């Protein structure tokens, strides 16, 4: 059994509108992890129990080099905890905000690893729904680690659909902004938005007001820098097609359409999943407590059976 007192709480890594992520050290092993702490009272009040159970189930049942692995999943009288592997390299958002834009080869490396992770998720009948730079992390070696499985949906095979209006505003697919249901192709639109941000240095559509932003996603056409390579323009135009049926990856073969696109011609997909490719950036962390790749807004902050959640209480064998 795993308890709250088995860990040392060092510093805050990130904070959401629902929960917080703290860098912890396991007392018995000396190993460092990232603990996502969620408050039970907030989750029950917002009727978000199903999504939280799914987040646990996806973290427990997935095994891929580009997905954050779960060590422990436990609960107390008022809190829900996820002890995940710590991504020392920070968010892709931190790096992109600093560097303004990435080269096409650097974007290709990250994009290839995200595609590999999304292929795996879709093959396990899981749709991610929240692809964004804040959810795409880098480990100590510089490889992608997708975190935050909070909006995942299980049991979505082939052309199966979802009905929940969810995601992140700036990353929402046009079909999600329409009534009724949507398919797995929403993840390819999300991939398109992050690839656009990485290669063009800005979001494809932006406005501070959500109502105006939604109009842009549904109605405005994408623009590309004149100097962007034709293969990159084609990848982005394909991933950012408004109709999911016309979108790259929106067909019956799903990930295969994205994998076989000319932008990824130089990529060996088996070399990607086996981590044989050299990272274009290696995090320069000196210790396991070095949080230089996390925002100061978070790290400088000081940290201080009827309610039983099902399908929790996990411990990893590997």
């Amino acid at each position: 059994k795993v308890t709250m007192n088995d860990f040392d709480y060092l510093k805050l890594l990130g904070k959401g509108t629902f929960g917080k992520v703290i860098l912890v050290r396991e007392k018995a092993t000396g190993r460092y992890y990232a603990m996502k702490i969620l408050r039970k009272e907030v989750i029950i009040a917002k009727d978000e129990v199903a999504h939280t159970v799914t987040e646990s189930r996806v973290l427990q049942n997935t095994r891929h080099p580009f997905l954050t692995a779960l060590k422990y999943a436990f609960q107390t009288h008022d809190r829900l905890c996820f002890v995940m592997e710590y991504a020392n390299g920070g968010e892709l958002f931190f790096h992109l905000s600093r560097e303004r834009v990435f080269t096409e080869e650097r974007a290709r490396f990250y994009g290839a690893e995200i595609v590999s992770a999304l292929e795996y998720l879709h093959s396990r009948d899981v749709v991610y729904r929240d692809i964004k730079l804040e959810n795409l992390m880098l480990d100590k070696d510089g490889h992608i680690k997708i975190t935050d499985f909070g909006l995942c949906k299980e049991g979505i095979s082939d052309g199966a659909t979802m009905k929940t209006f969810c995601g992140t505003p700036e990353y929402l697919a046009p079909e999600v902004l329409e009534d009724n249901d949507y398919g797995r192709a929403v993840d390819w639109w999300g991939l398109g938005v992050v690839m656009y941000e990485m290669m063009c240095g800005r979001l494809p559509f932006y406005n501070q007001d959500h109502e105006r932003l939604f109009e842009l996603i549904l109605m405005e056409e994408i623009r590309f820098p004149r100097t962007l390579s034709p293969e990159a323009k084609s990848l982005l135009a394909g991933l950012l097609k408004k109709d999911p049926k016309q979108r790259l990856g929106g067909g019956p073969s799903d990930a295969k359409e994205v994998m076989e696109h000319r932008f990824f011609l130089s990529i060996n997909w088996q070399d990607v999943v086996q981590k044989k490719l050299l990272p274009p950036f290696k995090p320069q962390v000196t210790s396991e407590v070095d949080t230089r790749y996390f925002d100061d807004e978070f790290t400088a902050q000081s940290i201080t059976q009827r309610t039983h959640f099902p399908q929790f209480d996990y411990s990893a064998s590997i």
Binding site: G16, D130, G150, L151, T164, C166, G167, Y171
Partner: peptide, 10 residues
Amino acid sequence: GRPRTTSFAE
């Protein structure tokens, strides 16, 4: 630019 973006669920 672009500020931090958070998720939602209806």
